[PDB]
């Protein structure tokens, strides 16, 4: 009668639906759903960016364009200076040098009502680097600043002889990038670096956002060290294969000999221009698990010193906005969900399965 | 004996409590609980606000008050100028004009270490608009800026003949609002717009925040186009109803004829003053699903040009803070929760219900 | 036979695992997990911080050290001035006064195109306070500002006779802290306060973040009133304990008599310096579950008045970033999870336990 059909249809439908929701739950657990927790952590000591300070790009470089035009070359063919015997690529890129060897990097953690300021003139002194925009300065940021008060800043001070013996530069370009990303300093300082004059020294103000990601199979992340090496290697490989030449430029690692003719130098330079525009979207390197963003606002300076190039970077805000991406839907949740799925419709437990197996085996 | 009472009490309590949690779960599932996910998306191209640049409000308008006072009128009765024959409302509000027809809107995406800047002087040139603050300029923001470098800005430049033939204005008022909100530009520029001088041209810095909401039955949202039309219609309808007159002012859509006497013009203007104050809280228009906020910081400009009214708007930060409101408690979760509630206490499945029905039908 | 061993092993394993997940679920429910919801609330009226305006710390105080040096003491021993009979500690700390009795605090909620600005010169006028940095001013912030437009600010203005009869001060220090925190104003203004000149009056710009925490047993909170009292009591108690003296300084509550000799005053001052550095980390006072953060950006002021000490605090952004920490995993969820765990493997309901009890009782 209709009883057989009714019961069979009910059992088949219940089994099918149980399979459907158990499969959906297992599938989404494998998808590793992840939520985001936002908090504002107050820091007793801040982790400074690496601060790469370049001059303006070659065409925008006052002091470099002035001395390359006197040779009799246009405002674009600054690499044609290589063709001359005495001038080589390294000599050409040493002319862009804006900072002398007197650059200092002090760290002022203003505090101690009883003892005054907290000057520290020996915090990871600057060192030379070669960037696409010339010969620049780099601040390794060896140690984290100790935050006590809003008067916590890092002051880059150069006191070269600003006189009429030579034409002085008009501005510099300071880029605050990740702690150990060497590709961001030698390639992207001229793009992401804020241009600031040196005649009137004002200050920046860095606020810290941190984004911790979850290492997921469908969207894996890497540590801050692997990502930098991956991205750099990709950048030089891409530039080398696009330029189709076997020479390099000062801002490239010493894998190949320096370019010695204007044609190859310009080929490499244009290849770098093309690669740097899309090195992010057109790159396979996995995102680093921890991403630090440095919101750079401006800040007036009331007392302007007589130093040549004074540049203060304030860290008056010690509340890092931390967004931690944490993985929800643990294994216990999946098991409970499966039990609920097969507890509403059906009613077979993990205990009756042993009964079925014993019946089968007798 | 006590067995009957004990068993009946247990069964009734279990059934009632099962109903209680099943009802609670279905009820909060219907409430559609929703969580928020925060992320920082890096954009290869930015979506610029619409930028409405007015003069300061009529009373604070330098060049307008100076010209209405010579007629012999007070600093408040600028609408009484209508009573004179030659002067009408449109003529009165054309005298507040501050920008000439030479205004241009360039878009500089600083890049190209090889080829220099990326000036683009034909980005959605400005057009006239009649605001409560007078005769203002609007920048529709037709296309999104391509972000490559921190030197990404939009520069509004007017080069009118700043001479002694006429008294020059002292400041303007720039409001960065969403794209197709014709009510924000035409009513709220004088209140929400930042006042900036024109003698010393500096720049703003816009950081984008985005909030995507979930369309919920108990908290519905509309698209950015329906909300603007709803709010604009509400504002004009409320102004007309409160003024109890059948004319309008240049900043109102051409639904009614322009007011031609000081009394009606002042009635409409006061009605607008009273409506704009509480237009958002005293309005039924449902919020928009996607809301964009433009955090406007200030920025220092080192090179000040000789142009009359020069003003850059920098977009050096390409990390949009996106807050996406996503619905938790999917139907699968509701079914699993119901099964769990029905499996801890009770023990009837959706498989025993078919047995009950078959017994009932025999 | 193997049937008995198989069945016993299956039953024991199922019971043990059921106990394991039930224990894990009950334990994590007791752990009381909590998620964070982020939103941007548009406020029609803003809640202003308490603004404590000090002079620069004694050593950096221009007008104070200038006259201290006239007596003939070094730049460290300003407390040695106590030894002279005419000068006591209160007299010494009254000499650091920078603000006269003419200080006023206006509130400008710029709006009303029909009526102009909204000056309000009677908004919680400043009052005297004693801080570690001298004799300062405090702005209790009695009422919340009504936000209508970006021209919403609080203007602190002092018009003392800036002439050559006396040497004028160089700068001040404004600290924006929570309302009823008397320890922040009297101890941490010299450290956490932004230093700004008074010759060139510019403006700040405060943006509001709010973090509401959940009162959890493992992470308890207290209301904003209990936390301030707890922390203040801790600070004074620790200062007294470390100084090992039974006197105080003007910036301490009148629990003990004022120090009357340089030795005790210096001991108390050094103890204060040591305590304030680690007063927050090295303290037991439970956090408050409503923490307000005041992001203080800078702003350009176009019109500079002739007033002696003028400073505006703009509140042009009315979107408070609210992070509410809401408690997930309610009791219903725990019961559903337990039922799911108990319905997957096992299959004994809360209804079968009553049967077991009735069998036991017969």
B336–C336 CB contact, under 8 Å: yes
- Chain C residue numbers with beta carbons less than 8 Å from the beta carbon of A336 are 21, 25, 336-338, 340-341, 344
CA dist B7 to A69, A156, B2, B3, B341, Å? 102, 83, 9, 6, 20
- Do residue B7 and residue B149 come from a single domain? no
Q: Report the residue from C114, C298, C339 with minimal CB separation from B341.
A: C339
On whether residue A94 sits in a domain, the answer given is yes
CB B290 within 8 A of CB B325: no
CB B113 within 8 A of CB B124: no
CB C201 within 8 A of CB C156: no
Give the DSSP letter string of B94-110: HTT--S-TT-EEEEEE-
A316–C273 CB contact, under 8 Å: no
CB B219 within 8 A of CB B235: no
Which of C297, C150, A103, A191 lies closest to B300, judged by CA? C297
Cα-only R_g, chain A: 30
On whether residue B270 sits in a domain, the answer given is no
Which of A94, A180, A59, A132 lies closest to A279, judged by CA? A132
Residue A129 has a CB neighbour count (10 Å cut-off) of: 19
Q: Distance (Å, rounded) from C-alpha A107 to C-alpha A123?
A: 6
Q: Which two tokens stand for residue B184?
A: 């924000």
On whether residue B101 sits in a domain, the answer given is yes
For chain A, how many residues are written? Answer: 362
Which of C132, C134, C144 lies closest to C45, judged by CA? C144
Q: Strand A203-212 relative to strand A194-197: parallel, antiparallel, unpaired?
A: unpaired
- Chain A residue numbers with beta carbons less than 8 Å from the beta carbon of B322 are none
Which of B60, B58, B48, B59 lies closest to B197, judged by CA? B60
CB C138 within 8 A of CB C52: yes
Residue C301 has a CB neighbour count (10 Å cut-off) of: 15
- Do residue B174 and residue B70 come from a single domain? yes
CB A350 within 8 A of CB C14: yes
Q: How many CA atoms lie within 13 A of C57 on its CB side?
A: 24
Q: Distance (Å, rounded) from C-alpha C246 to C-alpha C269?
A: 13
What CATH number does residue B173 fall under? 2.60.470
- Do residue B123 and residue B136 come from a single domain? yes
Phi, psi for A155 (deg, rounded to 5)? -115, 110
CB B178 within 8 A of CB B51: no
Cα-only R_g, chain B: 30
Phi, psi for B298 (deg, rounded to 5)? -100, 160
Chain C contact probe: residue of A18, A36, A317, A332 with most C CBs at under 10 A: A332
Strand partners, B36: B325
- Chain C residue numbers with beta carbons less than 8 Å from the beta carbon of A335 are 21, 340-341, 344
Q: Which two tokens stand for residue C173?
A: 């220090």
- Do residue B77 and residue B207 come from a single domain? yes
- Do residue B17 and residue B159 come from a single domain? no
On whether residue B47 sits in a domain, the answer given is yes
- Do residue B74 and residue B207 come from a single domain? yes
For chain C, how many residues are written? Answer: 362
B347–C342 CB contact, under 8 Å: no
Q: Which two tokens stand for residue B152?
A: 């990404």
Helix (H), strand (E) counts: chain B? 9, 14
* Residue C359 in contact with partner chain B when CB distance is under 8 A: no
Q: Which two tokens stand for residue B133?
A: 């603050």
C113–B57 CB contact, under 8 Å: yes
> Residue A64: enclosing H or E segment and its boundaries?
helix A62-69
Residue B313 has a CB neighbour count (10 Å cut-off) of: 24
Which of B159, B163, B291 lies closest to B227, judged by CA? B291
Q: Distance (Å, rounded) from C-alpha A326 to C-alpha A32?
A: 10
Q: How far is Cα of residue B284 from the mean position of the Cα atoms in its chain? A: 16
Nearest chain C residue (CA) to A115: C76
Residue given tokens 């140690």 in the structure block: A143
* Residue C345 in contact with partner chain A when CB distance is under 8 A: yes
Rama region for B176: left / alpha / beta (φ>0; ψ in -120 to 50; rest): beta
Strand partners, C105: C156
Q: Distance (Å, rounded) from C-alpha B3 to C-alpha B8?
A: 8
Residue B3 has a CB neighbour count (10 Å cut-off) of: 11
CA dist A296 to A204, A224, B8, B317, C56, Å? 6, 21, 71, 9, 26
> Residue A303: enclosing H or E segment and its boundaries?
none
- Count how many domains chain B has: 2
C191–A110 CB contact, under 8 Å: yes
Task: State which residues form the domain around B72.
Answer: 43-216+299-326
- Do residue B210 and residue B304 come from a single domain? yes
Nearest chain B residue (CA) to C110: B191
Q: Report the residue from C35, C113, C355 with minimal CB separation from B132.
A: C113
Max Cα-Cα span within chain B:
111
Residue given tokens 């300021």 in the structure block: A117
Residue given tokens 């090179």 in the structure block: B303
Residues B142, B143, B144, B148, CA torsion sign: negative
* Residue C39 in contact with partner chain B when CB distance is under 8 A: yes
Residues 6+ apart with CB under 8 A from B211: B290, B291, B292, B293, B322, B323, B325, C39, C40
Alpha helices in C61-119 (DSSP H): 62-71, 89-94
What CATH number does residue B25 fall under? 1.10.287
B237-240: list long-range contacts, CB under 8 Å, 24+ apart: B238/B271, B238/B275, B238/B279, B239/B268, B239/B271, B239/B272, B239/B275, B240/B271
Q: Distance (Å, rounded) from C-alpha A105 to C-alpha A128?
A: 13
Nearest chain B residue (CA) to A328: B328
* Residue A360 in contact with partner chain C when CB distance is under 8 A: no
Q: Which two tokens stand for residue C78?
A: 């300003």
| DSSP state at residue A192 | H
Q: How far is Cα of residue B126 from the mean position of the Cα atoms in its chain? A: 20
| DSSP state at residue B85 | S
Q: Strand A290-299 relative to strand A104-109: parallel, antiparallel, unpaired?
A: unpaired
Å between B29 CA and nearest CA of chain A: 16
Q: Which two tokens stand for residue C289?
A: 């579950």
Nearest chain C residue (CA) to B267: C114
Q: Distance (Å, rounded) from C-alpha A266 to C-alpha A274?
A: 12
Residues 6+ apart with CB under 8 A from C277: A111, A148
| DSSP state at residue A285 | P
Which of A128, A130, A232 lies closest to A184, judged by CA? A232
Residue given tokens 């009504």 in the structure block: C146
Q: For B20-49, give one letter per residue: b (16+ CB within 10 A) or e.
A: ebeebbeeebeeeeebbbbbeeebeebbbb
Residue A15 has a CB neighbour count (10 Å cut-off) of: 15
Residue C293 has a CB neighbour count (10 Å cut-off) of: 20
CB A52 within 8 A of CB A127: no
On whether residue C277 sits in a domain, the answer given is no
Helix (H), strand (E) counts: chain A? 9, 14
Which of A39, A89, A53, A117 lies closest to A323, judged by CA? A39
Strand partners, C307: none
* Residue A352 in contact with partner chain C when CB distance is under 8 A: yes
> Residue A254: enclosing H or E segment and its boundaries?
none
Strand partners, C194: C174
Experimental structure resolution, Å: 3.1
On whether residue B185 sits in a domain, the answer given is yes
Q: Report the residue from B24, B193, B293 with minimal CB separation from C150.
A: B193
B295–C207 CB contact, under 8 Å: yes
Q: Coil, strand, or helix at residue A118?
A: coil
Q: Distance (Å, rounded) from C-alpha C300 to C-alpha C135?
A: 28
Å between C161 CA and nearest CA of chain B: 29
Q: Name the packing angle between helices A331-344 and A2-31 (round to 10°).
A: 170
- Do residue B112 and residue B190 come from a single domain? yes
Phi, psi for A126 (deg, rounded to 5)? -65, 160
On whether residue C279 sits in a domain, the answer given is no
Q: Coil, strand, or helix at residue C31?
A: helix
What spatial distance separates the first Cα and last Cα of chain C, rounded to whole Å?
34
Residues C67, C71, C76, C81, CA torsion sign: negative
A190–B357 CB contact, under 8 Å: no
Q: Distance (Å, rounded) from C-alpha A264 to C-alpha A258?
A: 10
Q: Distance (Å, rounded) from C-alpha C118 to C-alpha C86?
A: 48
Q: Which two tokens stand for residue B268?
A: 């409409």
- Chain B residue numbers with beta carbons less than 8 Å from the beta carbon of A76 are 115
> Residue B144: enclosing H or E segment and its boundaries?
none
Q: Strand C152-158 relative to strand C52-55: parallel, antiparallel, unpaired?
A: unpaired
Q: How many CA atoms lie within 13 A of B9 on its CB side?
A: 7
Nearest chain C residue (CA) to B269: C114
3-state helix, strand, coil in chain B (%, to 5): 35, 25, 40
CB A92 within 8 A of CB A65: no
Phi, psi for B109 (deg, rounded to 5)? -105, 85
Q: Which two tokens stand for residue C155?
A: 């203007």
Q: Distance (Å, rounded) from C-alpha A269 to C-alpha A272?
A: 5
Q: Name the packing angle between helices B262-277 and B224-243 (round to 10°).
A: 130
For chain B, how many residues are written? Answer: 362
Q: Dihedral angle at the C-alpha atoms of A284, A288, A291, A294, nearest 10 degrees?
A: -60
Residues 6+ apart with CB under 8 A from C35: A35, A37, B35, C325, C326, C328
Q: Name the packing angle between helices C331-344 and B331-344 (round to 10°).
A: 70
| DSSP state at residue C229 | H
> Residue B194: enclosing H or E segment and its boundaries?
strand B194-197
Residues 6+ apart with CB under 8 A from A248: A240, A254, A255, A256, A257, A258, A259, A268
A60–B351 CB contact, under 8 Å: no
* Residue C273 in contact with partner chain A when CB distance is under 8 A: yes
Nearest chain B residue (CA) to C300: B298
On whether residue B191 sits in a domain, the answer given is yes
Residue given tokens 């050096």 in the structure block: B316
Å between B286 CA and nearest CA of chain C: 15
- Chain A residue numbers with beta carbons less than 8 Å from the beta carbon of C11 are 351, 354
Give the DSSP letter string of A313-341: EE----EEEEEEEEE-S-HHHHHHHHHHH
Alpha helices in chain B (DSSP H): 2-30, 62-69, 89-94, 182-187, 189-192, 224-243, 262-277, 331-344, 352-361
| DSSP state at residue A60 | G
Residue given tokens 């700068």 in the structure block: C171
- Chain B residue numbers with beta carbons less than 8 Å from the beta carbon of A211 are 39-40
- Chain A residue numbers with beta carbons less than 8 Å from the beta carbon of B29 are none
3-state secondary structure chain C: CHHHHHHHHHHHHHHHHHHHHHHHHHHHHHHCCEEEEEEEEECCEECCCCCEEEECCHHHCHHHHHHHHHHCCCCCCCHHHHHCCCCCHHHHHHCCCCCCCCCEEEEEECCCCCCCCCCCCCCCCCEEEEECCEEEEECCCCCCEECCCCCEEEEEEECCCCCCCCCCCCEEEEECCCCCCHHHHHHCHHHHCEEEECCCCCEEEEEEEEEECCCCCCCCCECHHHHHHHHHHHHHHHHHHHHCCCCECCCCCCCCCECCCHHHHHHHHHHHHHHHHCCCCCCCCCCECEEEEEEEEEECCCCCCCCCEEEEEECCCCEEEEEEEEECCCHHHHHHHHHHHHHHCCCCCHHHHHHHHHHHHC
Q: Distance (Å, rounded) from C-alpha B345 to C-alpha B326?
A: 32
- Structure solved using which method? cryo-EM
Q: Which two tokens stand for residue C299?
A: 């702003």
CB C256 within 8 A of CB C189: no
Which of C227, C242, C240 lies closest to C280, judged by CA? C227
- Do residue B81 and residue B146 come from a single domain? yes
Residues C64, C67, C71, C73, CA torsion sign: positive
Residue C151 has a CB neighbour count (10 Å cut-off) of: 21
Q: Name the packing angle between helices C331-344 and A331-344 (round to 10°).
A: 70
> Residue B261: enclosing H or E segment and its boundaries?
none
Q: Distance (Å, rounded) from C-alpha C149 to C-alpha B23?
A: 47
Apex CA A121: angle with CA A119 and CA A123, to 5°?
105
Strand partners, C116: none
Q: How far is Cα of residue B264 from the mean position of the Cα atoms in its chain? A: 30
What spatial distance separates the first Cα and last Cα of chain A, rounded to whole Å?
33
* Residue B230 in contact with partner chain C when CB distance is under 8 A: no
3-state secondary structure chain A: CHHHHHHHHHHHHHHHHHHHHHHHHHHHHHHCCEEEEEEEEECCEECCCCCEEEECCHHHCHHHHHHHHCCCCCCCCHHHHHHCCCCCHHHHHHCCCCCCCCCEEEEEECCCCCCCCCCCCCCCCCEEEEECCEEEEECCCCCCEECCCCCEEEEEEECCCCCCCCCCCCEEEEECCCCCCHHHHHCCHHHHCEEEECCCCCEEEEEEEEEECCCCCCCCCECHHHHHHHHHHHHHHHHHHHHCCCCECCCCCCCCCECCCHHHHHHHHHHHHHHHHCCCCCCCCCCECEEEEEEEEEECCCCCCCCCEEEEEECCCCEEEEEEEEECCCHHHHHHHHHHHHHHCCCCCCCHHHHHHHHHHC
């Amino acid at each position: 009668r209709w009883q057989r059909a009714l019961w069979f249809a009910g059992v088949v439908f219940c089994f099918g639906i149980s399979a459907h929701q158990i499969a959906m739950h297992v599938l989404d657990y494998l998808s590793e759903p992840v939520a985001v927790r936002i908090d504002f952590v107050a820091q007793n000591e801040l982790r400074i960016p690496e601060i790469t300070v370049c001059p303006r790009i070659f065409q925008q470089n006052t002091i470099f364009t002035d001395m390359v035009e006197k040779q009799g070359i246009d405002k674009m063919k600054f690499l044609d200076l290589i063709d001359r015997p005495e001038y080589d690529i390294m000599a050409v890129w040493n002319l862009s040098r804006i900072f002398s060897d007197n650059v200092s990097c002090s760290a002022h953690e203003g505090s101690s009502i009883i003892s005054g300021s907290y000057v520290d003139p020996n915090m990871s002194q600057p060192h030379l680097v070669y960037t696409t925009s010339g010969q620049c300065i780099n601040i390794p940021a060896s140690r984290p600043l100790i935050y006590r008060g809003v008067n916590t800043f890092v002051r880059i001070t150069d006191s070269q002889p600003r006189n009429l013996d030579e034409v002085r530069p008009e501005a510099i370009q300071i880029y605050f990038h990740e702690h150990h990303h060497a590709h961001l300093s030698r390639y992207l300082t001229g793009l992401r670096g804020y241009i600031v004059p040196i005649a009137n020294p004002f200050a920046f103000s860095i606020r810290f956002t941190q984004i911790n990601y979850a290492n997921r199979t469908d969207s894996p992340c890497v540590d801050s060290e692997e990502y930098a090496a991956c991205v750099e290697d990709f950048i030089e490989q891409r530039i080398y294969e696009k330029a189709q030449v076997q020479c390099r430029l000062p801002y490239m690692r010493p894998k190949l000999p320096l370019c010695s003719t204007p044609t190859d130098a310009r080929k490499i330079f244009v290849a770098t221009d093309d690669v740097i525009q899309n090195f992010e979207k057109e790159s396979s390197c996995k995102r680093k698990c921890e991403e630090n963003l440095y919101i750079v606002e401006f800040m007036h300076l009331f007392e302007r010193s007589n130093i040549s190039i004074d540049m203060s970077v304030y860290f008056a805000y010690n509340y890092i906005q931390v967004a931690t991406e944490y993985l929800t839907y643990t294994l216990r949740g999946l098991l409970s969900d499966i039990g609920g799925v097969l507890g509403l419709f059906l009613g077979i437990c993990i205990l009756s399965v042993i009964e079925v197996f014993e019946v089968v085996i007798f």
